[PDB]
Swiss-Prot record, chain A:
Top-level taxon of origin: Bacteria
Residues of the full protein shown: 48 to 95 of 124
Cell compartments where the protein resides: Cell membrane
Residue ranges of the TM segments: 23-39, 53-70
Annotated family: Belongs to the cytochrome c oxidase bacterial subunit 4 family.
Lineage: Bacteria, Bacillati, Bacillota, Bacilli, Bacillales
Protein's name in the database: Quinol oxidase subunit 4
Protein's job: Catalyzes quinol oxidation with the concomitant reduction of oxygen to water. Major component for energy conversion during vegetative growth.
Amino acid sequence: XXXXXXXXXXXXXXXXXXXXXXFGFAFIQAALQLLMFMHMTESENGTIQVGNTLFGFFGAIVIVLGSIWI
Amino acid sequence: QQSDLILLSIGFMLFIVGVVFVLFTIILVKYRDRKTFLEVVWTVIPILIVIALSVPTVQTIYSLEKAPEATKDKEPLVVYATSVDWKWVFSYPEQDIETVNYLNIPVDRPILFKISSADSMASLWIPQLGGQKYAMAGMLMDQYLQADKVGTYEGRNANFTGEHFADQEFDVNAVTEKDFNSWVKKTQPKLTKEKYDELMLPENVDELTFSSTHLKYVDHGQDAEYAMEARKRLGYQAVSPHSKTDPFENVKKNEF
Amino acid sequence: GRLNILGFWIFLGAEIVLFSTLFATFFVLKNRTAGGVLPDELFEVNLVMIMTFLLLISSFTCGIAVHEMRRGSLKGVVIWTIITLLLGAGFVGCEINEFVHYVHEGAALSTSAFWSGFFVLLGTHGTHVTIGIFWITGILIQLKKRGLTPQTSSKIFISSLYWHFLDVVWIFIFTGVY
Amino acid sequence: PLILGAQVSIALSTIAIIFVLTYFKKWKWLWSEWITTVDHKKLGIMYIISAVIMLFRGGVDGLMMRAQLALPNNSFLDSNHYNEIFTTHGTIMIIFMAMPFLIGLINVVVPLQIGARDVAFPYLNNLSFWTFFVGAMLFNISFVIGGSPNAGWTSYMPLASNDMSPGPGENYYLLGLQIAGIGTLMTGINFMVTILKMRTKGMTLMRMPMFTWTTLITMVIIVFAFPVLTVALALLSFDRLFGAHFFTLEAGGMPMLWANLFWIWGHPEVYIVILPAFGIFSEIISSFARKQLFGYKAMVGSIIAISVLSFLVWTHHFFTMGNSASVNSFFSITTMAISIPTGVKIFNWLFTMYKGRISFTTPMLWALAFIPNFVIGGVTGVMLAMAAADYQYHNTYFLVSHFHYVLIAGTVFACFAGFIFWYPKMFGHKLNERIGKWFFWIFMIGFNICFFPQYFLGLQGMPRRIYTYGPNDGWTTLNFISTVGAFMMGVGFLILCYNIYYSGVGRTLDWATSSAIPPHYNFAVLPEVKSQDAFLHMKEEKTELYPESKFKKIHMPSNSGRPFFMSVAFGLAGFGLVFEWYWMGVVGLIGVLLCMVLRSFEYDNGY
Ligand code: HEA
Ligand code: HEA
Ligand SMILES: [Cu+2]
């Protein structure tokens, strides 16, 4: 019931993503996965769980933007 | 030798650090045998050791980019540098002249080396000149050099090992401009078209004067695919055990 | 209580660096194809692929929350986990015919350097979603001589969140390659 | 070819010796209490005993290399031999020696100092050893069966595919490390959860004490700096076998793209080889000194700096390939910002050793020599960080002389420190101390006269990866002195093995066990600790022991024979793809078939 609200909102991001082509388009992609993954991390084993993927995306920015940086 | 002053000045900077820890161990320890505020105050000196180098090094990285230790702003001489396996290639675009495994340059004249390599990635070290930058197969890298004084400059390759790579030592001589203008040609053989393809095989070679430039062949600095049209057009691909000796099909110019 | 939910969770964070390495490889090999075929792919197939997977998580975000957590639909495990299992074959079947149709000029990784990354950035991509189907159906063999209760049969949740990590880079691929 | 004909008979002899002398009946002790065992204590033993085996394999390599490099015009090794020997020597270390030696010292000491039973997943940690071991036998069978790689431990792409030419050469380097990368990745996942959710009551997070903290940082970088290597070789494995053009020169692929992927994994993994080396030395220098590790808000806070700042510095191995200048100064300033979080950790061992007492034993000498020798190499890498001056001493031995002072003093000494200091844990008694000093002194003095002349060898003008120098300005003796010191370190490994033929001032849960060789369940009751150092507060202050009638049940994580069969499938598929089988593998697909069948058995076995 509560998860149906996020699933319906996620579909609009992909439809709006096609409208961008057919920064400004690099943040809608991460925001699509923020709502997708925020319904199953906290808590109990949280903080470490949601924190492990936090610096993992840091490496994704470091590896991608670092390779393009040359 | 522009960065050599860094090496000598930094050598004493770390020689102090080596003796500092001699005073932090040998002074006590022997005396001390059976028979919170200091750490935070220590964080003022370690940047001072690196920030005294995080400025002149950065003031030198940007220094080797633009016109370096030579001309100031005139006399633009270009020398295309290509590196085959074992063997080194240098072509002069100024006049149709092309030399391999030997190079002569005028003192106090800038030489804009265009660096690339055909068969394997490599880099023209030339230890007396100083900075050396990789020759990447697929693109040409611009590098500026000069010859400080007249002499015999040993030159070499970084030797990313590949069997016959140790004897990549090509001695380069740098003489006066007056002798160079007579020597810019010895006598500008010629570009025999086929002998260029006879170079990409990794063996041993002598001087080979060649009085004509090769940049008329796919630039070579661009389109590094000139490795299949080289070793394979003459029928040759090596292995590790037996049946080598360039798998048959002769025609070349070797030693002895 | 099982720590496998967290141990196999930091493994999902390791795959972030796994796909970032392939994304760094692909983004540098983007301006190549100096001698080959220029990329021109079907647009509607990309949305159909993404909309099928965006509805795949739609039937899975509420597939364990209003399933095992809210109330107790033990009979619905052969319903919600099976329907979400057929959608996994939709992405596999569509990507296979996408690769088979790519045989017509631009086949495999031998035509150009760019197509090497695309067929690999979507390669293990296609492998991770393929082994997940055999992992989601591997836990479905429990409603027989086992049939464990929630908060005990962790095999469903640890395989559901790994299945959720796919759509993370799946959309990042949608913006990455397209 | 003449030398490689003798060892293939000796390799068949050692296998034949196992059948007669050992295999009288081993399906009761070898297959039961070993091979597929689950106890973490027995797994870490199999890790370091392989590194000692690789120490002799890498030992005869390192000796005959410098023996060949004794003087110019020497005819010991030809071109295609010295190229394969020095590549095997470097790859046997770090990957197949320092990694199993460090993880082995981690897979044994860490789970005891935390009070827990085993690790997080003692089942996945079982295959985590064999996943490396089948990768070690893969890389070792390149001896006479196929051909050892000859592109260096880096093995750049433009000299690895067709320009290289040996078929079964680079494939061993690709499939050998690809399997071990899976086992090492799970080793970092097991201990990241083992130290986070399996600690005992009272063991606070900020104090547990410091070596276990380095292990925590060791297994954090593995999780984020090993999936890169998993695809960096997978991309290269596609170029060699499946005909991909990721970095091939022909189809136009970027030749340097494989370099950054290897170094994005390289330098962060380079700290994975020095992080447990720092941890093992952190306890020994603070245990026999009978003092407290003065400094935690700036020492554990410094261990997190190099954990995140290891991925903003990896572009320090390039510099020489024409970058964007500013990006060559960004990672040049940043590399200076890495020798500061590491630099504060040397000033933390000398003030924990002062004011307090000390007793020079054998494990102390390894910590005594670790302080200067690691700095003498560290006062050189600072020069390597200077990108403006890195162009002059790039490669040319000065690079080799810097790092050999860094890793051998850092890790190899820690591999020797943890070898002796935690030897009573493995079996009864320990090593003889007085004759153990003979091994320390000879191995120490030969280490300096081997690589400090290399500082002069490299600065004068001797490049690396060269089989003959030539009479250049009389720089022959500096190369021979480096060989004398090289062969001097060889003298000692015989002493090291002679010491093993014989067959304490603790401050943590080391000697807190019930007795020597601790039992399977390890610790009958979990210690309350509730302090920074448990053993000292549980000796003079009160007593606190394992009182009877307070015991309970067992753990019961018994053995399963799948981890051995699972890694055999990886070793079978790896060997099938390497030894010939260029385009596709007939038996390489079976290994994936056997693995996925066992991965179904993974979640089909109830326990
Ligand atoms: C863990 C790091 C590590 C360790 C421990 C060693 C161990 C040694 N290494 Fe090595 N080395 C590297 C890291 C290491 N090395 C790396 C990274 C490369 C380059 C890799 C590449 O790019 O390919 C390299 C290669 C390399 C070079 C550079 C090659 C070149 O540039 O041309 C040199 C220089 O002399 C060297 C020497 C030695 C010596 C003398 C030892 C000593 O420690 C030897 C130790 C030996 C023993 C402890 C046992 C002694 C053996 C015996 C006693 C048996 C004797 C019996 C008979 C001879 C029958 N090795
Ligand atoms: C254990 C692994 C390990 C560790 C810990 C280090 C530590 C460091 N390394 Fe190195 N390095 C290697 C493994 C390692 N390295 C390997 C394997 C290679 C060769 C790879 C190959 O090509 O095959 C290499 C080569 C290498 C390069 C590449 C050279 C090239 O391009 O060819 C560079 C460049 O910056 C470098 C620098 C440093 C610095 C600045 C540190 C610092 O972390 C060191 C910190 C220590 C100090 C800074 C000194 C102690 C500090 C003090 C006493 C405080 C006071 C000092 C100051 C204030 C300066 N080393
Ligand atoms: Cu580095």
